[PDB]
Amino acid sequence: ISADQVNQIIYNLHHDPFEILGCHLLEEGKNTKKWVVRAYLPKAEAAWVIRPTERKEDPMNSVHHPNFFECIIETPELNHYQLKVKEGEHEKVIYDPYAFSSPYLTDEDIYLFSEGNHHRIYEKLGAHVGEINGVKGVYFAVWAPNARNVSVIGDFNNWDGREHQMRKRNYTIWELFVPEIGSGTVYKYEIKNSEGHIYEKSDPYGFYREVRPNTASIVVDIDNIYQWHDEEWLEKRRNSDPLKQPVSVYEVHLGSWLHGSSAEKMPLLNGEADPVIVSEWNPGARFLSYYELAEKLIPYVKDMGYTHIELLPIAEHPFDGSWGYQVTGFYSPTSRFGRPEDFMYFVDKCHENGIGVILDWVPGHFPKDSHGLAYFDGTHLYEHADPRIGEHKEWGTLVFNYGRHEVRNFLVANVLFWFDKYHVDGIRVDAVASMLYRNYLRKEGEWIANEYGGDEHIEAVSFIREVNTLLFEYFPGILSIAEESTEWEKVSRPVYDGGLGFNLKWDMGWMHDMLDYFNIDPYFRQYHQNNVTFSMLYYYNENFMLALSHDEIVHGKSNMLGKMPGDEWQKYANVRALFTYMYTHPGKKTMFMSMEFGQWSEWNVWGDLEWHLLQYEPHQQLKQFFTDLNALYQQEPALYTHDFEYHGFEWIDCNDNTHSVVSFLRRSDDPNDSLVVVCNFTPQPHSHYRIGVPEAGYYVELFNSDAKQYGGSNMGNLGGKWADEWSFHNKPYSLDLCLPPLAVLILKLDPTKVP
Ligand SMILES: OC[C@H]1O[C@H](O[C@H]2[C@H](O)[C@@H](O)[C@@H](O[C@H]3[C@H](O)[C@@H](O)[C@@H](O[C@H]4[C@H](O)[C@@H](O)[C@@H](O[C@H]5[C@H](O)[C@@H](O)[C@@H](O[C@H]6[C@H](O)[C@@H](O)[C@@H](O[C@H]7[C@H](O)[C@@H](O)[C@@H](O)O[C@@H]7CO)O[C@@H]6CO)O[C@@H]5CO)O[C@@H]4CO)O[C@@H]3CO)O[C@@H]2CO)[C@H](O)[C@@H](O)[C@@H]1O
Ligand SMILES: OC[C@H]1O[C@H](O[C@H]2[C@H](O)[C@@H](O)[C@@H](O[C@H]3[C@H](O)[C@@H](O)[C@@H](O[C@H]4[C@H](O)[C@@H](O)[C@@H](O)O[C@@H]4CO)O[C@@H]3CO)O[C@@H]2CO)[C@H](O)[C@@H](O)[C@@H]1O
Ligand SMILES: OC[C@H]1O[C@H](O[C@H]2[C@H](O)[C@@H](O)[C@@H](O[C@H]3[C@H](O)[C@@H](O)[C@@H](O[C@H]4[C@H](O)[C@@H](O)[C@@H](O)O[C@@H]4CO)O[C@@H]3CO)O[C@@H]2CO)[C@H](O)[C@@H](O)[C@@H]1O
Ligand SMILES: OC[C@H]1O[C@H](O[C@H]2[C@H](O)[C@@H](O)[C@@H](O[C@H]3[C@H](O)[C@@H](O)[C@@H](O[C@H]4[C@H](O)[C@@H](O)[C@@H](O)O[C@@H]4CO)O[C@@H]3CO)O[C@@H]2CO)[C@H](O)[C@@H](O)[C@@H]1O
Ligand SMILES: OC[C@H]1O[C@H](O[C@H]2[C@H](O)[C@@H](O)[C@@H](O[C@H]3[C@H](O)[C@@H](O)[C@@H](O)O[C@@H]3CO)O[C@@H]2CO)[C@H](O)[C@@H](O)[C@@H]1O
Ligand SMILES: OC[C@H]1O[C@H](O[C@H]2[C@H](O)[C@@H](O)[C@@H](O[C@H]3[C@H](O)[C@@H](O)[C@@H](O)O[C@@H]3CO)O[C@@H]2CO)[C@H](O)[C@@H](O)[C@@H]1O
Ligand SMILES: [Mg+2]
Ligand SMILES: [Mg+2]
Ligand SMILES: [Mg+2]
């Protein structure tokens, strides 16, 4: 480029910056092409072009001006890249602001979509504010290749589509530009099928939706509604290995954490809306907005000391009672809680408070509702046509045709959409088995094998591996968590090693062993010591997340306190012992709302949590227990740096089944960060109980779950204990401890203590 062209950009004299900024073809070679990417980045000192799908990164050079950059790259196609932009000591990674010079679909967009590889398809499909032929308006586009006709119906034309019939392109996608309408427009697509039957559809790529049970899509100017402040969080994420950090997740269903009064409006970020009543049966209550949740949930979480909030599905879903697991509006956060920008504010405020956001994401199925994706164009479009692989009959839902390019593209781009537009830090996928097996919940003679004779759902396995490959390339440092309950191997291992590419898997076996164990009367736990120790045998085959989830405190399973045997003191003590053990056992942590304060009743998705219990001491004390435990977990490197390496854990002894006692070491990089953990899983205290330790010195009591401030009886070792030169558990030193009842001790050698 010339200096004159540069200066025209710098001084805002150029007639159209898209002619020189962004990605431009310089020449075609025999097997490759030569491209240039240019950027004007005021205040940046340096920039790079990242091609994350090819695993490449190229520096950009300043050209004529220190903030004007060019980068010349040879590659057959340059569809997928990001700009890394350094301003002083800070780096951000963004998409190229000059990537798309028109709102309409190009030939290239249609080709990439037809092949399933348009990672940014949601920039063109759906509804977008823009300018065509010199006039501002909205461009709509929808994939419906077998429809006979499609029109746009909405508020602007009183729901009559005759003067807004769309144009079909390349036998696949319908489009229309509508002048002089903008964000806030309410609409649907009116589709006529090959039979001549006419029906109404919500926008599959819609960005906002009326409040259930109304289903019209609403236009959002999604890049001009919210100003983020989380660059430093995102930079630290991208540069960190979350597997080596503390990950303590508070799992939350937004509709049922806390309700407000329906006698007032729902406040929004600088505005308000009518209340959304929780149900016809509880008409005095309304949901809290994303804005109100940012003001209340976030400081509550921060004060408890969790690192992450995990949300039950917030994608738009028509029925409260699915808990969000039956989604129909994949590209929009549910309007129950307000607007897209209110959810953006929630996430930005999490990041300001040093809290990450994980979204439950639901790629496995979708319900039959007529506004949604089902039979979209008068054919089986999103779902597979054969019910043996296209329906989950026990659930009444439809299964995406993962092999169909544009379907795969809908879902792959959807995952990326949440990280791009809403800055989230991770996803969790429920019931992964439901996608992986062609015989899932199907009887003999009601399913068919894959092409090689097996039960593996090949197309699903390939989709999952693609999701995870792309997610980690585009957004390094995120969490991708699976629950897979069969024995599928390598779930949380890299795709290059034959894995599915998640980085964490819920340890459902551990969960069952623990909750079954603790439900046993303590005298009988001696016959089930193996529940305590078993999960450590297979532990190193995956990266495990230890989750005690929402699913465990419904349908007659009781809440945590009610699972435990004995009187009220023992029930609390069991909950403290279990969770202290969970937090010291190797693996990341997840627990569900209500568990941190000892709610007695089961989670009820139709009300909110029993917050009035926090007026009473035993609940307050358990909440303080969790507050202090989370603080300890973040303060002790041996609880999180080496979760997934042999070095991080070793049993000291687990042979004392008749007293239900176990003990072990946790380790980190520094040997002085080593911890000794001792567990007593009956209410019988022990007074001179020997435990082997590897070195001399004073072992400080960092934590004792029987402390009186946690509701315990206040037995313990009075702050710490000197080890004896008395060999035990095959170690050269030993501690002579008092083991409090139904309690866990965490001890740490202080090598500077004065004898
Ligand atoms: O995570 C929450 C929280 O946990 C820790 O803090 C807890 C403790 O774990 C818990 O034990 C307790 O400690 C408090 C304590 O209640 C306060 O009274 C005070 O303790 C004083 C003590 O009162 C003084 O007398 C003095 O004790 C001497 C002791 O007099 C002397 O006899 C000897 O004791 C040895 C004893 O003779 C042996 O028999 C044996 O005693 C055992 C028994 O065998 C057993 O059956 C049972 O009863 O328990 C006894 C205790 O183990 O061993 C004894 C040696 O340990 O030597 C001691 C040494 O002084 O001194 C202490 C120190 O001031 O303060 C402690 C410490 O705060 O409550 C706290 C809070 O709930 C954790 O330390 C804290 O950071 C965490 O927040
Ligand atoms: O103009 C009349 C023509 O239209 C008719 O063909 C249609 C089909 O009915 C549509 O359903 C569609 O077919 C696409 C399909 O939508 C798309 O996903 C892709 O199919 C891939 C698939 O993703 C992949 O998994 C694998 O199985 O291979 C498939 C084949 O490539 O492409 C399909 C074929 O284009 O669109 C066409 C055109 O609208 C009619 O049947 C034609 O005979 C007729 O010419
Ligand atoms: O010096 C006092 C005693 O210290 C030790 O007693 C221990 C018990 O061994 C532990 O099991 C525990 O006791 C719990 C008990 O397990 C639990 O059932 C509950 O019992 C209460 C009950 O809440 C209450 O309503 C009423 O009925 O009285 C019962 C009192 O026992 O709560 C107890 C704790 O409060 O902890 C105690 C105290 O550390 C030691 O073993 C005893 O020999 C000694 O007497
Ligand atoms: O007054 C009662 C006694 O109290 C003290 O003994 C304690 C020990 O200090 C504790 O460690 C524990 O003992 C366990 C032991 O930790 C555990 O390994 C298991 O021992 C098995 C052993 O693993 C196996 O290899 C073989 O040698 O048999 C051992 C004996 O079974 O089980 C032990 C308990 O049964 O608890 C005891 C108290 O019961 C103090 O040290 C004693 O001297 C004192 O008398
Ligand atoms: O103020 C009058 C009226 O406004 C609201 O109704 C809107 C719907 O919520 C919205 O879905 C849309 O309804 C259209 C359907 O979506 C569409 O499928 C088709 O069947 O036509 C409908 C309009 O006829 O528009 C209406 C009207 O704006 C509010 O929710 C109503 O209850 C209220 O009475
Ligand atoms: O070093 C090998 C192995 O040692 C440790 O494993 C112990 C388990 O942690 C524990 O449950 C127990 O295993 C038995 C099962 O509980 C029982 O149900 C059945 O399958 O037999 C098992 C075989 O013994 O004891 C084992 C062996 O000590 C440690 O936890 C592992 O990580 C480690 O690899
Ligand atoms: Mg399940
Ligand atoms: Mg068993
Ligand atoms: Mg309530």
- Residues by chain with Cβ below 5 Å of ion ligand 9: 607-608
User: Ligand 1: distance of its center to the CA of 720 in Å?
Assistant: 8
User: Ligand 6: distance of its center to the CA of 527 in Å?
Assistant: 16
Structure tokens at 511: 């969960």
As a whole number of angstroms, the longest Cα–Cα distance in the chain is 91
> Which amino acid would we find at residue 604?
N
Q: Is the beta carbon of 689 within 6 A of some atom in ligand 4?
A: yes
163/154 Cα distance (integer angstroms)? 12
Neighbours of 571 (CB within 10 A): 19
Domain ranges of the chain: 1-99, 100-220, 221-642, 643-751
Ligand 4 atom nearest 687 alpha carbon: 4
Neighbours of 433 (CB within 10 A): 18
User: Ligand 4: distance of its center to the CA of 667 in Å?
Assistant: 25
Report the residue among 718, 721, 738 best suited for mutation to probe ligand 1: largest number of ligand atoms under 8 A from its CB: 718
User: With contact defined as beta carbons under 8 Å apart, do 181 and 219 qualify?
Assistant: yes
Q: Is the beta carbon of 618 within 6 A of some atom in ligand 2?
A: no
Resolution in angstroms, to 1 decimal, for this deposition? 2.0
**316 — phi, psi (to 5°)?**
-60, 130
Neighbours of 374 (CB within 10 A): 18
202/419 Cα distance (integer angstroms)? 23
Q: What is the Cβ-side half-sphere exposure of residue 115, based on CA atoms within 13 angstroms?
A: 8
- Out of 483, 513, 552, 643, which one is annotated catalytic? 483
**325 — phi, psi (to 5°)?**
-75, -5
Structure solved using which method? X-ray
Neighbours of 229 (CB within 10 A): 10
> Alpha helices, DSSP H only, in 424-564?
433-436, 458-474, 508-519, 530-533
Active site residue 303: no
User: Ligand 9: distance of its center to the CA of 599 in Å?
Assistant: 12
To the question of whether residue 608 is assigned a binding role by annotation, the answer is: yes
Q: What is the CATH number of domain 100-220?
A: 2.60.40.10
In eight-state DSSP terms, residue 620 is H
CATH class of residue range 221-642? alpha beta
Q: Do domains 100-220 and 643-751 have the same CATH topology?
A: yes
Nearest CA to ligand 4 atom 36: 689
Nearest CA to ligand 4 atom 5: 689
User: With contact defined as beta carbons under 8 Å apart, do 222 and 340 qualify?
Assistant: yes
Alpha-carbon separation of residue 12 from 41, 265, 504, 580 (angstroms): 13, 45, 48, 61
Active site residue 483: yes
Rg (CA), the chain: 28
9/19 Cα distance (integer angstroms)? 11
> Which amino acid would we find at residue 663?
S
- Residues by chain with Cβ below 5 Å of ion ligand 7: 431
- Out of 91, 310, 348, 430, which one is annotated catalytic? 430
527/537 Cα distance (integer angstroms)? 19
Nearest ligand to the C-alpha of residue 410?
2
434/397 Cα distance (integer angstroms)? 12
Ligand 4 atom nearest 729 alpha carbon: 18
Alpha-carbon separation of residue 266 from 224, 272, 554 (angstroms): 23, 6, 29
User: With contact defined as beta carbons under 8 Å apart, do 634 and 281 qualify?
Assistant: no
Q: Which residue has the tokens 């144009």?
A: 167
Q: What is the CATH number of domain 643-751?
A: 2.60.40.1180
User: Ligand 8: distance of its center to the CA of 32 in Å?
Assistant: 62
Q: Which residue has the tokens 């009183």?
A: 158
Angle at alpha carbon of residue 629, lines to 628 and 635, rounded to 5°: 90
447/458 Cα distance (integer angstroms)? 14
DSSP 162-195: TT-B-EEETTTEEEEEEET--TT-EEEEEEE-TT
Ligand 1 atom nearest 707 alpha carbon: 72
748/728 Cα distance (integer angstroms)? 18
The percent of the chain in helix, strand and coil, each rounded to the nearest 5, is: 25, 30, 45
Nearest CA to ligand 4 atom 33: 656
**510 — phi, psi (to 5°)?**
-60, -45
User: With contact defined as beta carbons under 8 Å apart, do 510 and 530 qualify?
Assistant: no
User: With contact defined as beta carbons under 8 Å apart, do 169 and 110 qualify?
Assistant: yes
> Which amino acid would we find at residue 602?
E
Residue 265: burial class (beta carbons within 10 Å; 0-12, 13-18, 19+): middle
Q: Which residue has the tokens 């993962």?
A: 402
DSSP 109-139: HHHHHHHT--TTGGGTSEEEEEEETTEEEEE
Neighbours of 55 (CB within 10 A): 8
- List CB contacts of 655: < 8 A, sequence separation 6 or more: none
680 closest CA partner among 697, 695, 663:
663
